[PDB]
Write an enzyme that holds these catalytic residues in place. Structure first.
Site, PDB file in Angstrom:
ATOM      1  CB  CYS A 101       3.045   0.842   7.404  1.00  0.00           C
ATOM      2  SG  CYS A 101       1.585   1.830   7.820  1.00  0.00           S
ATOM      3  N   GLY A 147       2.788   5.950  10.217  1.00  0.00           N
ATOM      4  CA  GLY A 147       4.078   5.671   9.624  1.00  0.00           C
ATOM      5  C   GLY A 147       4.821   4.493  10.209  1.00  0.00           C
ATOM      6  CG  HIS A 171      -0.405   0.188   2.532  1.00  0.00           C
ATOM      7  ND1 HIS A 171       0.271   1.335   2.894  1.00  0.00           N
ATOM      8  CD2 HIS A 171      -0.468  -0.576   3.649  1.00  0.00           C
ATOM      9  CE1 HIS A 171       0.626   1.251   4.165  1.00  0.00           C
ATOM     10  NE2 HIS A 171       0.188   0.102   4.645  1.00  0.00           N
TER      11      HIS A 171
HETATM   12  C1  LIG Z   1      -3.441   2.839   1.993  1.00  0.00           C
HETATM   13  C2  LIG Z   1      -4.246   2.292   3.199  1.00  0.00           C
HETATM   14  C3  LIG Z   1      -4.247   0.781   3.180  1.00  0.00           C
HETATM   15  C4  LIG Z   1      -5.681   2.847   3.196  1.00  0.00           C
HETATM   16  C5  LIG Z   1      -3.585   2.755   4.498  1.00  0.00           C
HETATM   17  C6  LIG Z   1      -3.752   4.227   4.883  1.00  0.00           C
HETATM   18  C7  LIG Z   1      -3.126   4.729   6.186  1.00  0.00           C
HETATM   19  C8  LIG Z   1      -2.346   3.773   7.079  1.00  0.00           C
HETATM   20  N1  LIG Z   1      -1.774   4.348   8.308  1.00  0.00           N
HETATM   21  C9  LIG Z   1      -0.399   4.955   8.243  1.00  0.00           C
HETATM   22  O1  LIG Z   1       0.096   5.457   9.190  1.00  0.00           O
HETATM   23  C10 LIG Z   1       0.450   4.977   6.941  1.00  0.00           C
HETATM   24  C11 LIG Z   1       0.141   4.478   5.694  1.00  0.00           C
HETATM   25  N2  LIG Z   1       1.139   4.717   4.881  1.00  0.00           N
HETATM   26  C12 LIG Z   1       2.086   5.370   5.575  1.00  0.00           C
HETATM   27  N3  LIG Z   1       1.639   5.526   6.841  1.00  0.00           N
HETATM   28  C13 LIG Z   1      -2.670   4.327   9.492  1.00  0.00           C
HETATM   29  C14 LIG Z   1      -3.818   3.314   9.331  1.00  0.00           C
HETATM   30  O2  LIG Z   1      -3.609   2.190   9.596  1.00  0.00           O
HETATM   31  N4  LIG Z   1      -5.233   3.433   8.954  1.00  0.00           N
HETATM   32  C15 LIG Z   1      -6.108   4.488   8.488  1.00  0.00           C
HETATM   33  C16 LIG Z   1      -6.381   4.028   7.060  1.00  0.00           C
HETATM   34  C17 LIG Z   1      -7.334   2.835   7.011  1.00  0.00           C
HETATM   35  C18 LIG Z   1      -8.728   3.301   7.435  1.00  0.00           C
HETATM   36  C19 LIG Z   1      -8.709   4.153   8.710  1.00  0.00           C
HETATM   37  C20 LIG Z   1      -7.350   4.413   9.379  1.00  0.00           C
HETATM   38  C21 LIG Z   1      -1.971   3.814  10.757  1.00  0.00           C
HETATM   39  C22 LIG Z   1      -1.039   2.642  10.720  1.00  0.00           C
HETATM   40  C23 LIG Z   1      -0.414   2.150  11.978  1.00  0.00           C
HETATM   41  C24 LIG Z   1      -0.715   2.828  13.307  1.00  0.00           C
HETATM   42  N5  LIG Z   1      -1.638   3.989  13.345  1.00  0.00           N
HETATM   43  C25 LIG Z   1      -2.270   4.478  12.087  1.00  0.00           C
HETATM   44  C26 LIG Z   1      -2.168   2.290   6.701  1.00  0.00           C
HETATM   45  C27 LIG Z   1      -2.810   1.785   5.391  1.00  0.00           C
END
Ligand SMILES: CC(C)(C)c1ccc(N(C(=O)c2c[nH]cn2)[C@@H](C(=O)NC2CCCCC2)c2cccnc2)cc1
Ligand SMILES: CC(C)(C)c1ccc(N(C(=O)c2c[nH]cn2)[C@@H](C(=O)NC2CCCCC2)c2cccnc2)cc1
Lengths: 298, 290
Positions: B143, B141, B39
């Site tokens: 991930c 961040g 992702h």
């Molecule tokens: C692209 C996709 C799959 C929608 C996504 C978007 C954001 C992230 N999150 C990143 O922090 C992040 C992503 N890329 C760089 N950083 C946060 C996340 O999980 N959920 C949000 C997105 C899904 C629906 C609601 C909340 C996160 C991760 C770990 C701990 N707290 C917050 C993870 C996946």
């Protein structure tokens, strides 16, 4: 919210094995010095009243076997500083990190790398109690394991482990060899005095609970600092000082809840308990997270 | 008794930063491949329904920026396996440990090395829950952070972190890109299912208590597997199997309390500085450390 330790790699590259006579334990290898507890030179009949200056004068360099992994290190000199022995070796450790030695105060936290035979076994977070003991997880032979913080890739060594007390808690020194508290490196009748809950830490943890999702424990009351202390000491809580109030100021400002308002919430939690609820995952009031630890994890 | 993680040095050496466009997270650098959540090629606009084979087809090697410390790694290829992106780099990692990719079972524990911008930040011990979530501590961040076990110089990687669920728990994959639990790497309304308590781990933790001082919960009684599982159902505890019983064998010996004896005790129910029945220590965890 987890109790999080620091990544232990920088300390792992420093742990060695020290053997003198029939006794083995851990050392900390920085530059060309190996630090270890001086009680490695105690004998089985020495244990009650050893004279370490006399035991030491009778040793030469080759009585000390130092091993870093499979490599044997040649000790070329030795001296004693308070309760730590300093073994000069012929090789500076190539893996020495940026480091410093610090002496910490009651309430401070740090990571511990538990080691046996110079090899690292596990890493956990710990705290210095007001009775100057450590509530550790140490087995026989863990002596010389060290406690540390890491801040901007500089490793702050604050604890070396020496001994277990009758109640299961642990006593040790800073890296200048001075004990925390009134304990001695001597088989003796010593016991840890009475211990208090670390009030400033509990308050930091309640702010952390507010920073996350929870406000169920707040109330509409406030309290003076003196009234708070008169109550909290009835539950064996450590008295809160003006320094502790200043220290909580940034968390107070961040959440919008005055320090003495949060003190009012704690007084009530002590009165009622949690009534089946939880705070950050725990059914106890947690006291081993500092105001600094809170800001780091959020 | 403490929650203790594995020493993290062998893994700290594998953490890198990965940037694709405006997005940054962590990657795992082993030999000459960097592993990270796929992702990372999602952009803010298409979070709701990414078409990942399309986004990856449009990608080229120069779309990915990899930094190990302050050295930029040159990407010479890219590839996807399930939900993990694989970036081929021109330099093998000189700090690669002996490792295996493994997939764990609910109830098993592992250590997590939380990282930000490729930089190790902290280490803690976790368990794979029965609803296949992780109750972790992960900020934006995080991930790309991994979970692992160590077995005499061999690091078994079992978890890579992907996303947070609305209850604040976390979802990820094994290192082959297969999700744990019924979750997708999409901005969707997904929630963790009902979570049962890990009965074999609770029992293990009671044995750890007897092994130290705490003995007050013991009794003279014994239950049957079926009468206990009836109580287990009431309190949302995982039913106990003959496998769980056999696995607690060593601890049952070391104490003289048979599992169904301890189960009578657990039926009736501070125990190790806790007023909760703790369920993230496995039998093996208890035997180590002790
Ligand atoms: C692209 C996709 C799959 C929608 C996504 C978007 C954001 C992230 N999150 C990143 O922090 C992040 C992503 N890329 C760089 N950083 C946060 C996340 O999980 N959920 C949000 C997105 C899904 C629906 C609601 C909340 C996160 C991760 C770990 C701990 N707290 C917050 C993870 C996946
Ligand atoms: C020589 C001296 C000062 C009396 C001493 C003796 C033994 C040790 N203990 C070593 O295991 C050990 C010693 N040398 C190599 N290993 C253990 C220890 O404290 N028992 C105490 C028992 C009562 C009287 C004092 C010592 C230990 C166990 C668990 C965790 N931490 C340490 C520490 C200091």
């Amino acid at each position: 919210f987890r109790k999080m330790a620091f990544p232990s790699g920088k300390v792992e590259g420093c742990m060695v094995q020290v053997t003198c006579g029939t006794t083995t334990l851990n050392g900390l290898w920085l530059d060309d010095v190996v630090y270890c507890p001086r009680h490695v030179i105690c004998t089985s009949e020495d244990m009650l009243n050893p004279n370490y200056e006399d035991l030491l004068i009778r040793k030469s360099n080759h009585n000390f076997l130092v091993q870093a992994g499979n490599v044997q290190l040649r000790v070329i000199g030795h001296s004693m500083q308070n309760c730590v022995l300093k073994l000069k070796v012929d090789t500076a450790n190539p893996k020495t990190p940026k480091y410093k030695f610090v002496r910490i105060q009651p309430g401070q936290t740090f990571s511990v790398l538990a080691c046996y035979n110079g090899s690292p076994s596990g890493v956990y977070q710990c705290a210095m109690r007001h009775n100057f003991t450590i509530k550790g997880s140490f087995l026989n032979g863990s002596c010389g394991s060290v406690g540390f913080n890491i801040d901007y890739d500089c490793v702050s060594f604050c604890y070396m482990h020496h001994m277990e007390l009758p109640t299961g808690v642990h006593a040790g020194t800073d890296l200048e060899g001075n004990f925390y508290g009134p304990f001695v490196d001597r088989q003796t009748a010593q016991a840890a005095g009475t211990d208090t809950t670390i009030t400033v830490n509990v308050l930091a943890w309640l702010y952390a609970a507010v920073i996350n999702g929870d406000r169920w424990f707040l109330n509409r009351f406030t309290t003076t600092l003196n009234d708070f202390n008169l109550v909290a000491m009835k539950y064996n809580y450590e008295p809160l000082t003006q320094d502790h109030v200043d220290i909580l100021g940034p968390l107070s400002a961040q959440t919008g809840i005055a320090v003495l308002d949060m003190c009012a919430s704690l007084k009530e939690l002590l009165q009622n308990g949690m009534n089946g609820r939880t705070i950050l995952g725990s059914a106890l009031l947690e006291d081993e997270f500092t105001p600094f630890d809170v800001v780091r994890q959020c």
